[PDB]
Structure 1
Amino acid sequence: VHLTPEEKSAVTALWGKVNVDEVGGEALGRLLVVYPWTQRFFESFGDLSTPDAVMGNPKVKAHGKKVLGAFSDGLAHLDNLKGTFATLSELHCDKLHVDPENFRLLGNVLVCVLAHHFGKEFTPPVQAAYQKVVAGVANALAHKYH
C-alpha cells in the first residue's frame, strides 16, 4: 500500500480527532449487527441479542478499543504493515480461522463510522486515503493465508 504525503496528512489530521476509547467499539459493534455471522466468534461476550445490547455491551467496547489500537499502530507504520500485523495474522488466520473477507468488512465499517462522526470533513479524497489504509491493514492481517 501506497499513500501520498497529502493522503497521509489527511489521514493523520482526522485521526488525531478520533475518540480512541469509543470508535473501535462503535465499529466492532456495527460489524456484529450488520454482518451477524461475525457473532460466531464472540460467544463469550454475552448479550448480543439486539443492536442496543451489542452497542452497550461493555466487552464489545473494550474489545473494540484493542482493535482500534491496532489500526492506530498501522497508521504509525504505513510502510511495514506486514510486520506490524504478524502476530495478529497468526491469531486471526491460524488460530481463529476468520475468513479474511471479514477483515475488509471491518475496515469498511470503520470507514462508515468515520464518515458518521466527521460528516462533511470526511471528504471523498479523505475517504480514498482511508480506503488505502484499511485495505493495507486487511491484506497484512491476511498474510498467513497467502
Structure 2
Amino acid sequence: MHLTPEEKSAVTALWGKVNVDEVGGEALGRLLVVYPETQRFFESFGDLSTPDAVMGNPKVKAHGKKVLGAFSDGLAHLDNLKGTFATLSELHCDKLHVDPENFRLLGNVLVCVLAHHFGKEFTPPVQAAYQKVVAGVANALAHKYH
C-alpha cells in the first residue's frame, strides 16, 4: 500500500475518532439507497423500498457494523491487506457471488460518510489518503476472484 508515513498517520488518527456502529450503518444504508442495484444481495433484510426504510432497517445497520469492523481490522494490516482479506475474498467470490465493482462503490460512499461527519477535519489531503486505502481494500477483496 504505497502509503506515506504522513498518510498512514492521517488515516489512523481520523479513524481513532470514528463511531464504527454509526458509520457502518450509515455507509451500508447510503449504498443501498444511492445505488439500488446493490439491493440484489440483501433481499432477505426486509423492506428497502424507501430511504427511511433502508436507513431504519436493523439488519442493514447490523450488517454495516460487521462490514466496517472487518474494515477496521484491515487498517491495522495496511502493509498486508491482501493477506488479511484473503479468506473474505474467497467467500465474497465463492459463496456470495458479489461483483467486486461493488467494493469500489462502497468505498466512495464511505468516503462521503466520513466527510459528512468530520466536516472541516476531512481535508483534501486526508481524503486523498482515504481514497488510497479504500481502493487498497477493494483490490484485496477482489484478489482471490477466479
What's the CA shift string for 1:78-129, capped at 9, x where partnerless?
Answer: 0110111111101111222211111011011000000100011100000000
Partner of 2:100: 100
Q: Are residue 60 (structure 1) and residue 57 (structure 2) matched?
A: no
The answer (yes or no) to whether the contact 2:24–2:65 under 8 Å persists in 1 is yes
Runs in 1 of length 4+ with deviation above 3 angstroms?
A: none
Distance 2:114 2:44 in 1: 28
| Percentage identity across paired residues of the two chains | 99
C-alpha deviation, 1:145, in angstroms: 2.2
Cα deviation, 1:66-86, whole Å, max 9, x if unaligned, reads: 011111011110011011111
Q: Deviation of residue 133 (structure 1)? A: 0.5
Count of residues paired in the alignment: 146
C-alpha separation in 2, matches of 1:82 and 1:99: 17
CA contact (8 A) 1:94 1:144 kept: no
**8 Å CA contact retained: 1:88, 1:141:** yes
User: What runs of 5+ residues in structure 1 fail to find an aligned partner?
Assistant: none
Partner SS, residue 74 of structure 2? helix
Could you list the runs of 5+ residues in structure 2 that have no partner in the other structure? none
